[PDB]
Amino acid sequence: AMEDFVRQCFNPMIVELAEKAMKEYGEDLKIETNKFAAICTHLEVCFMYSDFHFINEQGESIVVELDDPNALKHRFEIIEGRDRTMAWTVVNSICNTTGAEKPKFLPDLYDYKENRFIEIGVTRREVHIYYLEKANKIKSTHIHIFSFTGEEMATKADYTLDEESRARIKTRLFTIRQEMANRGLWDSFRQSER
Ligand SMILES: [Mn+2]
Ligand SMILES: [Mn+2]
What we know:
Shape: globular
Number of helices: 7
Keywords: RNA-dependent, RNA polymerase, transcription
Entry title: Influenza polymerase fragment
Bound molecules: manganese (II) ion
Largest sheet: 5 strands, mixed
Number of domains: 1
Name: polymerase acidic protein
Assembly: monomeric
PDB class: transcription
Radius of gyration: 17 Å
C-alpha cells in the first residue's frame, strides 16, 4: 500500500531520485517502505525551499544538472539530491568563491543571501527532538526543521524564507499526511520514526 501511495502522490523525478538513493545506500524499498516515503518527502521539501526549477526556460527538463551542473545563478544553491561527490564539489566551489566556512557535514542548501549553508529536516514527531538530534552534532550551518503538523524550529528563530514560501511547504506536508491517513498509512509512518 505505501509504495503505491508514494508512486501515485510524489512527482516522477522525486520518486526516481529517491529510488536511486535507496538502491545506492543499500535499502530495500520493499522492506523499508516508510523510509522510501520519508526520502521522497525530504527531497521535495529541499527542492521547494530552494525554489529549484526542474524545467528550463527553453521548456526542457534538466534533472541531469543535479549530477552534472552548469554555472553555480539564484539565491539558493541545492546541495541535496546530487551525487555525493558532485555535492562536495559544489560545496567546495561555493566556499572558494564566497569564502564561506567549509562544513564538516554535507548540508542541504547554500544561501548566498545569508552566506550560510542550511541543514533541512522533516519530522513526524515534536519538532525540537529532531532539531536537537541534528544540532548536537552540527556545530557552526543553519538548521530548519519542519513537522507534518505545521510546526517549525530553526536556528536563532530565523526561518530564512518568507511566510508565504514557508506556508507552501507546510501545506504540502499537511496534504501528504492527510492522504496517508485516508489510506490507513499515517499511524505506521508516524510510529516508524522512533
Ligand atoms: Mn542532506
Ligand atoms: Mn537535511
